[PDB]
RNA sequence: GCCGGCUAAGAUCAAGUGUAGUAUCUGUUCUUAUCAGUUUAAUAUCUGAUUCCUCGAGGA
């Protein structure tokens, strides 16, 4: 319960897919070929990928339900 | 009839100085000995002459025919400190369910660990009550003694007569006879007091 | 020298004990020619009783010292005898007895010893197998890397066992399994591990807690030797199951598959659909270079 | 049913897989089906062979009919006088010209057929016209050779 | 009340005493001790310098994590000292 | 305001997932989508039921342990351990999906020993010997259903036959593995 | 288990015995009934309401 990311029976759709994504993107942010094929892909800097896909880290998948 | 399945073992010559416990130790090294139902004490019997002389020979059967067969291959032509004992299946020449399922239990590969029996009753009594009453304290532990007895064999019972909440110690054999104890006494009236039970 | 050392091995001074199962141990690895075998069991089944001394440095002589007698004797007659003693005797020695068979099969290889301990598990009698089972545990703890050739031999006792009603049985099958997981780990034994874990994955909507315990050690154990993505499709049917009881127990191994090897999972999700209000594809991994 | 072959009179060599293997060169064979005993619990001679089409069922009834399989008379089917240990292979018609050479019969005879599988049970009842015909049947077919099966005839009914 | 600390664990390494000296602390094995183990700042202090891990008596030889909790990385969680509240 | 078995299987992809007690979930389109997905096997079916996992029938009483052929073929010598790995086999295996349940335990060649208890000889070297059912293969024609398969004496010569095989079915590259051992 | 059923398929409430732990046995009862609320994946559970026939009695 201590550790971010683990859930239980009441978890949501939002807050597991929300998890994933988030350390989706610390991953890219660590793997350093993984940010290579995306910075060739879209034809950006190294440091503008990191850094969009840090801005992108606050909310991702959108504002929650209700 | 039965020519196998024999868990006798029949000890030829023995020091004549011999103990029982001290057999009974050569002989469980080898296995479990089978005890007698209706009682304690092991199957052993220590042959003897006419009088206290010890004729030098025993017997032992065991619960398993294994352990027979153990002691036949570690203990015949082998020495004790002075003596060279002689190992051979005994001859013979001329309540059950239950104990025999327990030493079967003895046997049993069941999980271990686990956590790895005592009830505090209070607001039972008041000093104040046995101040000018030398004999309500005596029929109070009585009347305890006698409530405690209804719920499993209690070994231990003490009464606080200084304590001001008036705490009684019950001290059992089993937890649960405790814990049905304890069950039994919280919400109970005790001279016209509801007196509390709980574990400890 | 050897008869009259003998009887020193009941003293019950430390340093006395060392030195005298040390020496005991060097004549065995190099003199062992020179006594008869029936001595030597004497003496093998005398050791058996310092296996539960409270000193590390008498354990750790006596580990070497059974070794070497084992190896010298053969491992015939000596399994026959700790066989024999593991059924009838109290737990102590029973557990001794298991280190014992772990021993033997480690110093003259495990080949020698396993047909005549699964030929024991054929015995229609309780309190028989569940020490099998035990010695299979203990002997797969102990041996390790070396286990990676016997995986094949044990897998239909183990069906056996875990196809059985006895909770114990199932209990130690599945300290089995655990232990034969982490003890082949890199060395290409997947398909027995997953038959055996199509097994295992049934006994996870059980109440007892010694049963649930050793379930939870195994797939915790197959979480290292089979791979996280296995246990993740072995969960995701489970996570949003309607029953509340289905839900806590699929959770609880999710968050044990989770807290480790959290960063290879991110490879492993499944695809997701965006819906009206929020987006749930991952699109950076749908570009294609 | 229509697609399924009724195999009657297989001895104790005779297996689940064997008539599948032996049905095999005739047509696709899906399974194979054998009820057992509830007294000696094994085959009593009559089993199933289902098959994907019918055609395959038919040219098994009538490629493996009257065969010598394992020493007895396997033959594949569409699935006062008592005559018993008959071979599966003849008919009404075959067992009313078969008894033609002795007397004649009074009518068409009926077969005794399992419960289960409805091809032959092993015995069978015919009626004669008189009783010299019976007389006939009881002291010459009454152990003659048929298609490797010996054949029995007595009498259902006699008064002393 | 048999609870780990589980504080971040420092330089101080752990003992074992007489009676626990070739345990394991997490899961109580004897087989292939593999990694040193180390607890907290508080666990080592004044009256608690030296002490088994296990039990609390006077330690007298190293704590060490079985190769089997150092392959699941059982050993990267908090300080292992058992203690009772 | 909780979907219907038929209402929730018509926005489904895929309805034959679909259970009873899906629409009772706090999410059963995530449900049912994980139901879908090309893996990740299924619970293991007896949460629902009410006697704990061992069923109490199906006459489980049977041979305590068969020991595999390896088992049968001092004790034995490296010889012996030649032996033992020579015969070592690899046992019958389920792949990934396949979980365990009470239930799931019970649910032109012709052989020598039923050619020689049908009476039919072995075949000579140049005759005809056919099988008793050749003969109406003869008579009426090849079989519809195996148009493929050869019979000695009518599509087969006679010089073929040998031993116990009667036919022989005619169904009208590179196969070797790269890395190897030698 | 035997040839759909013979009430060994489940829950529960009191007491006894006993273990480090699991447990084991006896009396029971089992709503034969309806509605509303709680709750359960659904049951379950709990929380409340609800003259006639026969031979002085019994049943509904
Ligand atoms: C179910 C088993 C029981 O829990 C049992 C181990 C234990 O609980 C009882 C209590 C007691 C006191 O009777 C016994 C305790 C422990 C033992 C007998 C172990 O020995 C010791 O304590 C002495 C010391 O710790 C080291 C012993 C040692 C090196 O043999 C140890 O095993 C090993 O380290 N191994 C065994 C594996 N072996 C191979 C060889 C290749 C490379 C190294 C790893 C694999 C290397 C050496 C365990 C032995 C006894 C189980
Ligand atoms: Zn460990
Ligand atoms: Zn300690
Ligand atoms: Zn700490």
Redesign the interface.
């Known amino acids: 319960s201590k550790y971010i990311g683990t859930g239980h029976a009441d978890t949501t759709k939002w807050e597991w897919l929300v998890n994933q994504h988030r350390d989706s993107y610390c991953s890219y942010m660590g793997h350093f070929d993984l940010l290579n094929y995306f910075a060739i892909a879209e034809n950006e800097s190294k440091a503008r990928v990191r850094f969009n896909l840090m801005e992108k880290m606050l909310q991702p998948c959108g504002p929650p339900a209700d | 009839v039965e020519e196998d399945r024999n868990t006798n073992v029949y000890v030829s010559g023995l020091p004549p100085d011999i103990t029982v416990d001290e057999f009974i130790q050569l002989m469980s090294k080898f296995g479990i000995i089978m005890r007698d139902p209706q009682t304690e004490e092991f199957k052993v019997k220590l042959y003897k002459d006419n009088q206290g002389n010890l004729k030098g020979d025993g017997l032992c059967c065991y619960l398993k025919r294994e352990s027979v067969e153990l002691a036949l291959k570690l203990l015949d032509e082998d020495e004790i400190r002075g003596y060279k004992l002689h190992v051979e299946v005994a001859k013979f020449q001329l309540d059950y369910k239950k104990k025999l399922s327990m030493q079967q239990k003895q046997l049993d590969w069941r999980p271990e660990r686990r956590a790895g029996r005592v009830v505090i009753i209070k607001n039972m009594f008041h000093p104040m009550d046995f101040e000018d009453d030398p004999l309500v304290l005596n029929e109070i532990r009585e009347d305890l003694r006698v409530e405690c007895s209804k719920f499993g064999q209690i070994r231990k019972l003490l009464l606080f007569d200084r304590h001001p909440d008036g705490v009684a110690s019950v001290s059992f054999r089993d937890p649960e006879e405790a814990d049905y104890c304890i069950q039994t006494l919280d919400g109970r009236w005790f001279g016209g007091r509801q007196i509390t039970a709980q574990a400890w | 020298l050897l008869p009259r050392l003998t009887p020193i091995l009941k003293n019950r001074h430390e340093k006395v004990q060392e030195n005298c199962i040390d020496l005991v141990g060097r004549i065995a690895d190099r003199g062992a020619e020179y006594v008869s075998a029936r001595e030597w069991m004497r003496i093998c089944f005398e050791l058996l009783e310092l296996l539960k001394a409270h000193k590390k440095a008498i354990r750790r002589a006596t580990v070497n010292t059974f070794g070497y007698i084992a190896k010298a004797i053969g491992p015939h007659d000596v399994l026959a005898t700790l066989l024999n003693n593991l059924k009838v005797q109290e737990r102590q020695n029973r557990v001794c007895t298991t280190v014992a068979i772990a021993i033997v099969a480690e110093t003259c290889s495990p080949f020698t010893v396993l047909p005549a301990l699964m030929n024991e598990y054929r015995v229609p009698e309780l309190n028989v197998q569940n020490g099998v089972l035990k010695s299979l545990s203990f002997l797969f703890e102990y041996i390790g890397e070396m286990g990676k050739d016997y995986i094949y031999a044990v897998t239909p006792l183990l069906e056996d066992a875990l196809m059985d009603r006895d909770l114990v049985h199932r209990q130690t099958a599945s300290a089995v399994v655990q232990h034969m997981s982490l003890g082949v780990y890199g060395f290409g034994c997947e398909d027995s591990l997953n038959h055996l874990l199509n097994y295992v994955w049934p006994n996870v909507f059980e109440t007892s807690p010694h049963v649930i315990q050793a379930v939870m050690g195994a797939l915790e154990g197959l979480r290292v030797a089979i791979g996280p993505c296995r246990m993740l499709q072995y969960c995701l049917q489970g996570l949003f199951h309607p029953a509340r009881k289905v839900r806590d127990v699929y959770w609880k191994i999710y968050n044990s598959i989770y807290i480790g090897s959290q960063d290879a999972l991110i490879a492993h999700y499944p695809r997701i659909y965006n819906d009206d209000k929020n987006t749930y594809i991952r699109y950076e991994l749908d570009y294609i270079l | 049913q229509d697609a399924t072959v009724y195999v009657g009179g297989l001895?104790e060599?005779?297996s689940e897989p064997?008539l599948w293997?032996?049905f095999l060169?005739?047509?696709?064979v899906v399974n194979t089906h054998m009820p057992k005993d509830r007294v000696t619990g094994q085959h009593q001679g009559y089993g199933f062979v289902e098959?994907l089409?019918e055609?395959?069922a038919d040219?098994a009834i009538?490629?493996?009919?009257m065969?010598?399989?394992?020493?007895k008379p396997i033959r594949v089917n569409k699935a006062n006088i008592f005559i018993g240990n008959l071979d599966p292979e003849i008919d009404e018609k075959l067992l009313y010209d078969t008894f033609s050479a002795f007397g004649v019969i009074l009518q068409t005879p009926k077969i005794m057929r399992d419960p289960d599988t409805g091809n032959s049970k092993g015995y069978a009842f015919i009626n004669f016209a008189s009783f010299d015909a019976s007389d006939a049947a009881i002291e010459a077919m009454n152990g003659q050779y048929l298609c490797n099966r010996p054949i029995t005839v007595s009498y259902a009914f006699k008064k002393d | 009340d048999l609870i780990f600390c589980r504080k971040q664990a420092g330089v101080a390494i752990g003992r074992l005493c007489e009676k626990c000296d070739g345990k394991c602390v997490i899961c109580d094995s004897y087989v292939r001790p593999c990694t040193l183990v180390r607890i907290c700042d508080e666990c080592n202090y004044g009256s608690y310098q030296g002490r088994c891990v296990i039990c609390g008596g006077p330690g007298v030889s190293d704590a060490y994590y079985c190769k089997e909790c150092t392959i699941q990385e059982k050993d990267r969680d908090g300080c292992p000292k058992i203690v009772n509240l | 305001n909780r979907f219907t078995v038929a209402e929730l299987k018509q926005l489904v992809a895929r309805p034959d997932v679909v259970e009873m007690h899906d629409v009772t979930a706090q999410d059963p389109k995530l449900l049912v989508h994980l139901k879908a997905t090309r893996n990740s096997v299924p619970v293991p079916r007896h949460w629902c039921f009410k006697r704990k996992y061992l069923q109490g029938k199906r006459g489980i009483e049977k041979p305590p342990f068969e020991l595999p052929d390896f088992i049968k073929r001092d004790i034995d010598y490296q010889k012996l351990h030649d032996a033992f790995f020579k015969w070592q086999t690899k046992p019958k295996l389920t792949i990934h999906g396949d979980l365990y349940y009470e239930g799931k335990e019970f649910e032109?060649?012709?052989?020598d020993?039923?050619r020689i208890?049908?009476?039919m000889p072995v075949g000579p070297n140049a005759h005809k010997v056919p099988p008793?059912?050749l003969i109406?293969?003869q008579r009426?024609g090849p079989?519809?259903?195996?148009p493929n398969?050869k019979i000695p004496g009518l599509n087969s010569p006679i010089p073929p036959l040998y031993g116990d095989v009667f036919?022989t079915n005619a169904a009208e590259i590179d196969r070797t593995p790269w890395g190897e051992l030698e």
Do not use: C, H, R, T
């Not at chain 4, 060169?25 to 696709?28: E, M």
């Not at chain 4, 009538?62 to 009919?65: A, G, L, S, V």
């Open positions: 001895d060599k005779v064997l293997e032996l060169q005739a047509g696709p098959f089409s055609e395959d040219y009538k490629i493996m009919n065969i010598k399989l394992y020493g | 032109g060649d012709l052989s020993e039923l208890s049908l009476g008793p059912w109406a293969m009426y079989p519809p259903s195996y398969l036919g």
